[PDB]
Amino acid sequence: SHMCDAFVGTWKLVSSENFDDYMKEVGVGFATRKVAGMAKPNMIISVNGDVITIKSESTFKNTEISFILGQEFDEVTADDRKVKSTITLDGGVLVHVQKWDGKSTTIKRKREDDKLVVECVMKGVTSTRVYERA
Numbered sequence: 297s298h299m300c301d302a303f304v305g306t307w308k309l310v311s312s313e314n315f316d317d318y319m320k321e322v323g324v325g326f327a328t329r330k331v332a333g334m335a336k337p338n339m340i341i342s343v344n345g346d347v348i349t350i351k352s353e354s355t356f357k358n359t360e361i362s363f364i365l366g367q368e369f370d371e372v373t374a375d376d377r378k379v380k381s382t383i384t385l386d387g388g389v390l391v392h393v394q395k396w397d398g399k400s401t402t403i404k405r406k407r408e409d410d411k412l413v414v415e416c417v418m419k420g421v422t423s424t425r426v427y428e429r430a
């Protein structure tokens with residue numbers, strides 16, 4: 297319990313850096329990059345018992361994952377990858393690893409001041425996505 301208290305709530309995307317390059321590294325095609333890159337998703341995080349749910353709500357796509365920390369699950373990403381995901385807490389940071397087609401990407405989420413900072417890493421490319429409470 298209480299593991300994710302400071303993450304819970306509704307968050308709105310307020311800044312994005314190097315997301316197109318991240319998406320290129322991931323293998324997202326041109327048209328999806330352009331439309332996905334315009335989106336300003338809300339992120340909705342909730343907890344019930346041991347189950348954490350993370351939703352996106354946007355113009356482009358709505359996504360939803362529910363999971364237990366450390367327990368691998370199937371995920372369909374906003375760009376339509378079918379991945380195997382595992383999410384853990386490492387020193388108060390949610391660490392989300394996605395595996396597909398022999399590739400891997402890691403998304404880290406942390407609270408910093410009044411923001412929720414999301415760092416997406418694919419090989420040598422990092423993108424930073426900053427959210428504030430909605």
Ligand SMILES: Cc1ccc2c(c1)c(-c1ccccc1)c(-c1ccccc1)n2CCC(=O)O
Pocket residue numbers: 319324332335337338339340350351352353354356357358359373374375403414416425
């Ligand atoms: C290609 C790609 C890769 C990673 C992506 C997305 C798209 C979208 C998304 C983009 C546009 C619309 C909807 C979802 C979201 C997302 C956003 C918020 C919540 C949960 C996941 N993530 C996680 C990183 C982020 O916070 O941006």
